[PDB]
Scaffold this active site. Structure first.
Site, PDB file in Angstrom:
ATOM      1  N   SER A 149      57.107  34.815  52.035  1.00 48.95           N
ATOM      2  CA  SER A 149      58.400  34.200  51.648  1.00 48.95           C
ATOM      3  C   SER A 149      58.625  32.727  52.075  1.00 48.95           C
ATOM      4  O   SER A 149      59.625  32.383  52.730  1.00 48.95           O
ATOM      5  CB  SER A 149      59.576  35.104  52.039  1.00 48.95           C
ATOM      6  OG  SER A 149      59.636  36.234  51.168  1.00 48.95           O
ATOM      7  N   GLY A 150      57.677  31.867  51.697  1.00 48.49           N
ATOM      8  CA  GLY A 150      57.785  30.419  51.930  1.00 48.49           C
ATOM      9  C   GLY A 150      57.496  29.919  53.338  1.00 48.49           C
ATOM     10  O   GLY A 150      57.620  28.700  53.600  1.00 48.49           O
ATOM     11  N   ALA A 151      57.122  30.833  54.243  1.00 48.81           N
ATOM     12  CA  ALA A 151      56.748  30.466  55.619  1.00 48.81           C
ATOM     13  C   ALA A 151      55.397  29.730  55.656  1.00 48.81           C
ATOM     14  O   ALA A 151      55.032  29.085  56.656  1.00 48.81           O
ATOM     15  CB  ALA A 151      56.705  31.702  56.502  1.00 48.81           C
ATOM     16  N   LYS A 204      47.259  28.451  47.355  1.00 47.59           N
ATOM     17  CA  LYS A 204      48.376  27.616  47.748  1.00 47.59           C
ATOM     18  C   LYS A 204      48.480  26.431  46.771  1.00 47.59           C
ATOM     19  O   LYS A 204      47.483  25.709  46.594  1.00 47.59           O
ATOM     20  CB  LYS A 204      48.177  27.152  49.178  1.00 47.59           C
ATOM     21  CG  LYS A 204      49.294  26.339  49.717  1.00 47.59           C
ATOM     22  CD  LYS A 204      48.972  25.972  51.107  1.00 47.59           C
ATOM     23  CE  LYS A 204      50.144  25.315  51.746  1.00 47.59           C
ATOM     24  NZ  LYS A 204      49.704  24.739  53.060  1.00 47.59           N
ATOM     25  N   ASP A 218      45.825  26.729  60.682  1.00 47.86           N
ATOM     26  CA  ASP A 218      46.744  25.571  60.943  1.00 47.86           C
ATOM     27  C   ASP A 218      46.273  24.590  62.029  1.00 47.86           C
ATOM     28  O   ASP A 218      47.108  24.013  62.764  1.00 47.86           O
ATOM     29  CB  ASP A 218      48.119  26.075  61.360  1.00 47.86           C
ATOM     30  CG  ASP A 218      49.171  25.894  60.306  1.00 47.86           C
ATOM     31  OD1 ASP A 218      48.958  25.166  59.304  1.00 47.86           O
ATOM     32  OD2 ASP A 218      50.254  26.487  60.528  1.00 47.86           O
TER      33      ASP A 218
HETATM   34  C1  469 Z   1      45.655  32.447  55.752  1.00 44.21           C
HETATM   35  C2  469 Z   1      46.222  33.272  54.562  1.00 44.21           C
HETATM   36  C3  469 Z   1      46.773  32.317  53.546  1.00 44.21           C
HETATM   37  N1  469 Z   1      47.859  31.510  54.156  1.00 44.21           N
HETATM   38  C4  469 Z   1      48.099  30.362  53.310  1.00 44.21           C
HETATM   39  C5  469 Z   1      46.860  29.547  52.860  1.00 44.21           C
HETATM   40  C6  469 Z   1      46.215  28.708  53.792  1.00 44.21           C
HETATM   41  C7  469 Z   1      45.116  27.929  53.386  1.00 44.21           C
HETATM   42  C8  469 Z   1      44.689  27.972  52.048  1.00 44.21           C
HETATM   43  F1  469 Z   1      43.630  27.202  51.670  1.00 44.21           F
HETATM   44  C9  469 Z   1      45.332  28.821  51.114  1.00 44.21           C
HETATM   45  C10 469 Z   1      46.424  29.609  51.509  1.00 44.21           C
HETATM   46  C11 469 Z   1      49.082  32.290  54.468  1.00 44.21           C
HETATM   47  C12 469 Z   1      49.658  33.124  53.309  1.00 44.21           C
HETATM   48  C13 469 Z   1      48.589  33.295  55.470  1.00 44.21           C
HETATM   49  N2  469 Z   1      47.364  34.069  55.023  1.00 44.21           N
HETATM   50  C14 469 Z   1      47.352  35.419  55.164  1.00 44.21           C
HETATM   51  O1  469 Z   1      46.400  36.097  54.822  1.00 44.21           O
HETATM   52  C15 469 Z   1      48.648  36.053  55.676  1.00 44.21           C
HETATM   53  C16 469 Z   1      49.320  36.905  54.819  1.00 44.21           C
HETATM   54  C17 469 Z   1      50.529  37.453  55.232  1.00 44.21           C
HETATM   55  C18 469 Z   1      51.447  38.298  54.634  1.00 44.21           C
HETATM   56  C19 469 Z   1      51.212  38.988  53.285  1.00 44.21           C
HETATM   57  O2  469 Z   1      50.074  38.944  52.834  1.00 44.21           O
HETATM   58  C20 469 Z   1      52.183  39.974  52.545  1.00 44.21           C
HETATM   59  O3  469 Z   1      53.309  40.083  53.035  1.00 44.21           O
HETATM   60  N3  469 Z   1      51.798  40.617  51.379  1.00 44.21           N
HETATM   61  C21 469 Z   1      52.778  41.475  50.682  1.00 44.21           C
HETATM   62  C22 469 Z   1      50.412  40.462  50.776  1.00 44.21           C
HETATM   63  C23 469 Z   1      52.434  38.570  55.511  1.00 44.21           C
HETATM   64  N4  469 Z   1      52.203  37.873  56.633  1.00 44.21           N
HETATM   65  C24 469 Z   1      53.095  37.849  57.772  1.00 44.21           C
HETATM   66  C25 469 Z   1      51.055  37.175  56.509  1.00 44.21           C
HETATM   67  C26 469 Z   1      50.357  36.326  57.370  1.00 44.21           C
HETATM   68  C27 469 Z   1      49.164  35.757  56.950  1.00 44.21           C
HETATM   69 CL1  469 Z   1      48.344  34.732  58.087  1.00 44.21          CL
END
Ligand code: 469
Ligand code: BOG
Length: 335
Positions: free
Chosen positions: A29-31, A50, A165
């Site tokens: 959710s946009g975090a 992303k 990060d």
């Molecule tokens: C590292 C990846 C991608 N990341 C963003 C990302 C970073 C670099 C890039 F190149 C592409 C995307 C965030 C979504 C976290 N992430 C996850 O797998 C993730 C994913 C989630 C997540 C969910 O996946 C979820 O709620 N659903 C329903 C799939 C809920 N939380 C609290 C999460 C925490 C993490 Cl760290």
């Protein structure tokens, strides 16, 4: 040849992604930014895509895009988030407007797998092993993470972990808190100790209600800075404050971590030292007896070193944009 892209409204913008990426739905959710879970038909992997937001809107935006792209491209390690893919739907530099980054969907972070419970000593060995292996790599590239906390640690159901990060306030080294001009890599070691304590005990080690509260909690576990550490303080205001403190003994960790493995406690002692020059490094911690069932000196790789000077230039937007475009074009996906 360029893939076929498809357009599909998502997060209230029009995404254009290669057809290989299927079933896009928003996560976190946009975090995390503007992110969707996807199925990568090509690799069979669940991935996070992303769409960078406003990437070339300003000089600082452009600069930060370039940095995020270059960092991710450089990080190739099992315990650090890297790139599966990077694309733009653009055919030219003059078309170049949007950047999309692809990585593994781990699907939870450390809190999302721990839920304030005590972990077993074995599960704690495994989780901390992986942070330290990943951090050995980042640190060999001459990067300092600086904000290592459980929300920055991606974990799948199998408790395989990647650091995200890389480069609350409860996990922060005291000198990061206090805004010291300089710091070393062991600011991250401090964070790993806080994480490890909390994993063993079920509880946050230093749950300060604010900056000063945190600092008093830290000092109370690890004593007031001794004479040797005080010799290393530059700032007269900080010096004056320290000497005005009432001296107090370092607490015994055996009595804070009651019942823990004595090798865990020994490690916690070596991590949570007030003086940053005196904390264990990540390469040393990986050799500590605590990780004997996991440590493999032939599979704890180091990074090629990373040029942070390329990302801290003062350039025009169009210069940062053409550079970022060359990073996209020059991307070669992992084996
Ligand atoms: C590292 C990846 C991608 N990341 C963003 C990302 C970073 C670099 C890039 F190149 C592409 C995307 C965030 C979504 C976290 N992430 C996850 O797998 C993730 C994913 C989630 C997540 C969910 O996946 C979820 O709620 N659903 C329903 C799939 C809920 N939380 C609290 C999460 C925490 C993490 Cl760290
Ligand atoms: C309450 C006051 C205690 C805070 C002490 C923090 C000391 C951290 O340790 C210090 O880290 C610095 C890097 O930031 C280095 O310049 C020093 O060599 C090192 O002693």
């Amino acid at each position: 040849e360029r893939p076929t892209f498809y357009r599909q409204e998502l997060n209230k913008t029009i995404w254009e992604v290669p057809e290989r990426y299927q079933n896009l739905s928003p996560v976190g959710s946009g975090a995390y930014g503007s992110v969707c879970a996807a199925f990568d038909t090509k690799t069979g992997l669940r991935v996070a895509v992303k769409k960078l937001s406003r990437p070339f809107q300003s000089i600082i935006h452009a600069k930060r895009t370039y940095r995020e792209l270059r960092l991710l491209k450089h990080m190739k390690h099992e315990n650090v988030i890297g790139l599966l893919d990077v694309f733009t739907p653009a055919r030219s530099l003059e078309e170049f407007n949007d950047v999309y980054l692809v990585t593994h969907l781990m699907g939870a972070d450390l809190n999302n797998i721990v839920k304030s419970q005590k972990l077993t000593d074995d599960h704690v060995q495994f989780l901390i092993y992986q942070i330290l292996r990943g951090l050995k790599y980042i640190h060999s590239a001459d990067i300092i993470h600086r904000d290592l906390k459980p929300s920055n640690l991606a974990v799948n159901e199998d408790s395989e972990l990647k650091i995200l990060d890389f480069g609350t306030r409860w996990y922060r080294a005291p000198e990061i808190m206090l805004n010291w001009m300089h710091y070393n890599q062991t600011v991250d070691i401090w964070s790993v100790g806080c994480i490890m304590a909390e994993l063993l005990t079920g509880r946050t080690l230093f749950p300060g209600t604010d900056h000063i509260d945190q600092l008093k909690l830290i000092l109370r576990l690890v004593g007031t800075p001794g004479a040797e550490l005080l010799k290393k303080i530059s700032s007269e205001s900080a010096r004056n404050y320290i000497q005005s403190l009432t001296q107090m003994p370092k607490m015994n960790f055996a009595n804070v971590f009651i019942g823990a493995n004595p090798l865990a406690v020994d490690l916690l002692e070596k991590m949570l030292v007030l003086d940053s020059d005196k904390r264990i490094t990540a390469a040393q911690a990986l050799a500590h007896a605590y990780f004997a069932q996991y440590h493999d000196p032939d599979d704890e790789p180091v990074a090629d070193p990373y040029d942070q000077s390329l990302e801290s230039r003062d350039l025009l937007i169009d210069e940062w944009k053409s550079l970022t475009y060359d990073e996209v074009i020059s991307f070669v996906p992992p084996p």
